[PDB]
Design an enzyme around this catalytic site. Structure first.
Site, short mmCIF file in Angstrom:
data_model
loop_
_atom_site.label_atom_id
_atom_site.label_comp_id
_atom_site.label_asym_id
_atom_site.label_seq_id
_atom_site.Cartn_x
_atom_site.Cartn_y
_atom_site.Cartn_z
N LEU A 74 39.84 35.81 43.01
CA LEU A 74 39.66 35.02 44.08
C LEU A 74 39.76 36.07 45.38
O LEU A 74 40.27 36.98 45.50
CB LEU A 74 40.84 33.87 44.38
CG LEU A 74 40.73 32.94 43.37
CD1 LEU A 74 42.16 31.92 43.69
CD2 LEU A 74 39.71 31.89 43.66
N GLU A 75 38.89 35.35 46.46
CA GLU A 75 39.02 36.27 47.66
C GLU A 75 40.34 36.01 48.13
O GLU A 75 41.23 35.20 47.78
CB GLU A 75 38.11 35.45 48.64
CG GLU A 75 36.56 35.32 48.03
CD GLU A 75 35.71 34.34 49.12
OE1 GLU A 75 36.28 33.30 49.35
OE2 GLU A 75 34.55 34.65 49.50
N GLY A 76 40.55 37.14 48.93
CA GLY A 76 41.94 37.44 49.56
C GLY A 76 42.66 38.78 49.48
O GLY A 76 43.69 38.75 49.87
N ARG A 77 42.28 39.75 48.57
CA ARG A 77 42.57 41.02 48.54
C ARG A 77 42.31 41.79 49.50
O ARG A 77 41.07 41.63 50.02
CB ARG A 77 42.40 41.41 47.13
CG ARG A 77 43.36 40.89 45.92
CD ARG A 77 43.08 39.60 45.55
NE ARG A 77 44.16 39.17 44.49
CZ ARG A 77 43.97 38.30 43.77
NH1 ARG A 77 43.01 37.30 43.83
NH2 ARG A 77 44.92 37.90 42.89
N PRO A 127 32.69 52.89 29.31
CA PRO A 127 33.34 51.41 29.59
C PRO A 127 33.22 50.83 30.77
O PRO A 127 33.34 51.37 31.84
CB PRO A 127 34.71 51.71 29.00
CG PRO A 127 34.87 52.90 28.24
CD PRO A 127 33.78 53.72 28.81
O1 LIG Z 1 44.48 34.92 41.51
C1 LIG Z 1 43.24 35.60 40.88
O2 LIG Z 1 42.86 36.26 41.42
C2 LIG Z 1 42.70 34.41 39.71
F1 LIG Z 1 41.60 34.98 39.25
C3 LIG Z 1 42.96 33.40 39.54
C4 LIG Z 1 44.10 32.48 39.77
C5 LIG Z 1 44.08 31.08 38.74
C6 LIG Z 1 44.98 30.05 38.82
C7 LIG Z 1 46.27 30.34 39.67
O3 LIG Z 1 47.23 29.32 39.75
C8 LIG Z 1 46.38 31.63 40.65
C9 LIG Z 1 45.14 32.61 40.56
#
Ligand SMILES: O=C([O-])/C(F)=C\c1ccc(O)cc1
Ligand SMILES: O=C([O-])/C(F)=C\c1ccc(O)cc1
Ligand SMILES: O=C([O-])/C(F)=C\c1ccc(O)cc1
Lengths: 61, 61, 61, 61, 61, 61
Positions: free
Chosen positions: A8-11, A1
């Site tokens: 999003l960036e930030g982790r 699999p």
């Molecule tokens: O946080 C993430 O990793 C993400 F992919 C999307 C997201 C979409 C809308 C929001 O309000 C917060 C995060």
């Protein structure tokens, strides 16, 4: 699999390592897939390349 | 976050339900993302459309 | 440019024809790309293969 | 509906914002999808990672 | 490496077998990757789900 | 035909050029697709964004 996690960036690198561990385990215990067969890809998104309802996150509060 | 799980056909509807739940929990607990922001896509493959080492699975003996 | 629209099954052939045309015009008018360089792919999803908040759409009540 | 627009690097941030607006609108008016349900991802390509007819764009005039 | 070949429906099972083999050899000989580390996915498209210049292939005349 | 080659960072620009040539040729001679219709995308992966068996490559020897 093959699991692709798009977020999003930030982790932190630690959160990414944990994500891979947990996701791999979740897949293993629900699909009967062998551990060495579970692949995970992490794809990071930029706020100016991600939009909802016609508005990019970089253009929101 | 958006998670795409690509796997071979065969899993039961029940296994898919569990896959979605477990994977969502793994993401939530590991990235901090809230449940309503966690989307999961399931993509199934055919044995004749997946190959390793130049041999499709439908051709392995 | 290459545009992939991933959506649930259900749209009529007519709606898809309009989707392709409108989306192509949006890209052309907004990026400067010439029509013959604008490709659009449509990908349909099944309600039992798409989930939000750990619940597949086919399992919502 | 999830829309992924894959295009070459070179567009301004303004063109990207417009692209998102227009594409989101095109999808909304042709598929009956609610506005807050339309997501757009922009993926930029490098000329040395894109080829046609066996020739990468970075290797063309 | 992971190779995804996305093409229109129509190829025979034989052509797909050859596609997988040739593509795997191309990757092996050009990147140095070992055969057991080369995975190939085949994705087929429908003529009514693929468009160029705002016209789906199923609508060309 | 659209070919996406996803591989780890580390290849030279020359290997990438060769990959495109060879892969394009492999597709052309096994699918009967015209040369100007074969597109290749190269997607590079980072070791800390790629995992197998729950372990990211950046966390392995
Ligand atoms: O946080 C993430 O990793 C993400 F992919 C999307 C997201 C979409 C809308 C929001 O309000 C917060 C995060
Ligand atoms: O311009 C773009 O955004 C693109 F995705 C492709 C392209 C392909 C061939 C060309 O001659 C020009 C642009
Ligand atoms: O090398 C590559 O381009 C690759 F995509 C994967 C890989 C996976 C496991 C290995 O042990 C080595 C390479």
């Amino acid at each position: 699999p093959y699991v692709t996690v798009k977020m999003l960036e930030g982790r932190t690198d630690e959160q990414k390592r944990n994500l891979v561990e947990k996701v791999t385990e979740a897949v293993k215990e629900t699909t009967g897939a062998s551990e060495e067969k579970i692949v995970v890809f992490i794809e990071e998104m930029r706020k100016d390349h991600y939009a909802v309802a016609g508005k990019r996150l970089s253009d929101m509060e």
